[PDB]
Amino acid sequence: AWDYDNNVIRGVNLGGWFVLQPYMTPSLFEPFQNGNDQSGVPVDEYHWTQTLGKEAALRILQKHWSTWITEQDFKQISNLGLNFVRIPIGYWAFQLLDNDPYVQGQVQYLEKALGWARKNNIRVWIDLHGAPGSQNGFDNSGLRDSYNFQNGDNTQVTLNVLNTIFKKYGGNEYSDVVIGIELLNEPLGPVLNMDKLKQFFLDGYNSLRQTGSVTPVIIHDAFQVFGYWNNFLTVAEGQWNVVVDHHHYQVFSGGELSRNINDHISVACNWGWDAKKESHWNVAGEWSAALTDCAKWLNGVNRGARYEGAYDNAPYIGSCQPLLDISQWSDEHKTDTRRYIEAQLDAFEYTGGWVFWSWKTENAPEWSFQTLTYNGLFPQPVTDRQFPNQCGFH
């Protein structure tokens, strides 16, 4: 359904749909604020659903699932020249732990989305974005500040959920639409046992293939250095149809945020050069236009921005307030943004392609493909360049 040698992925993530992220849909979290006090705002989907209870959570989420993304979005995605979407989903859509607060019902909409993709010639990865106990302690896993994916029976539960996904979506029924199943989003390598993580990846790979599936297996890089995965899941060992997913941002540390625009561009170009050297097919499964961490709650509920020296002991660089509204951006910031987008596009098209995070947000323009496109900052058509050949690839 895809030729990873000859085709290039040009896609968007459908983030915020099946896994709630406060910065993407702040309207769902803001009713819990008490004036200026954010101490009572639930920090993740786990606590959001727990605080609301099963009845209220399902009522509110059914409204969200039916409106956030619809068939019209898939039409617009196709119309903009995109050929691909990545769909994050949490384990709880398929299986609940005893005492889990989560509600189910996402699978109905996942299956509607697969049909809308078929109708609009869009291909798909299904991405297991959240594992029981959390694989990274990020709020985008469902459960912030916990790192228990490798504890107890949580790895086994994850494999059981993957087997369900493999049987439903890795078979003949969706072979024209599904071009990858991503085993686990962003396992936080530095805090995990990497030998056990590799065993988990291998078990997932073997399990899928054992069902008769030929669907590509997507492994996230676990924040390892370029080339780390070169000797894992290799054709020499009869392991085939494997893709590495690299995520690339320059906003989650003081050092990255303090770079001038030229140095941001140099780093982007180098992502391209280094990815070209790797031995697996690879795709930039997440990246954005952000040059700041200013979006409200990007770092989590009740945490500030490093950019204005309000988090992570970072120095003050600049005030966020002026950057929250794209109509208030300086001409210089608009130009820097366009340069940065084009450099990243060139770097990522140099290997397997790219998947922007994300299609839409309520009010965070740096993270919204729609907003950037409508404001002329994301190239349309996506091959247009105002700043041609910043990287000098050959």
Host domain of residue 46: 1-394
Amino acid, single-letter form, for residue 97: L
Experimental method: X-ray
d(C-alpha 25, C-alpha 322), whole Å? 20
Q: Kindly calculate the radius of gyration of the chain based on its CA atoms and give it in whole angstroms.
A: 20
Residue 73 sits in a domain of what CATH number? 3.20.20.80
- DSSP readout, 51-71? HH-HHHHHHHHHHHHHHSS-H
What resolution (Å)?
A: 1.9
d(C-alpha 365, C-alpha 341), whole Å? 13
Of 182, 186, 308, 366, catalytic: 186
Amino acid, single-letter form, for residue 127: D
Q: Which residues contact 288 (CB under 8 A, 6 or more apart)?
A: 249, 356, 357, 358, 366, 367
Of 71, 237, 278, 286, catalytic: 286
For residue 285, give both structure tokens: 């499964």
At 151, is the secondary structure helix, strand, or coil?
Answer: coil
- Angle CA 76–127–94, to nearest 5: 110
242's enclosing H/E stretch is strand 242-247
Distances, alpha carbon 111 to alpha carbons 1, 30, 96, 366, in Å: 18, 30, 20, 29
Q: How many folded domains does the chain comprise?
A: 1
Active site residue 349: no
Active site residue 186: yes
Closest C-alpha among 147, 37, 18, 36 to residue 94? 18
Chain mean position to CA 55: 29
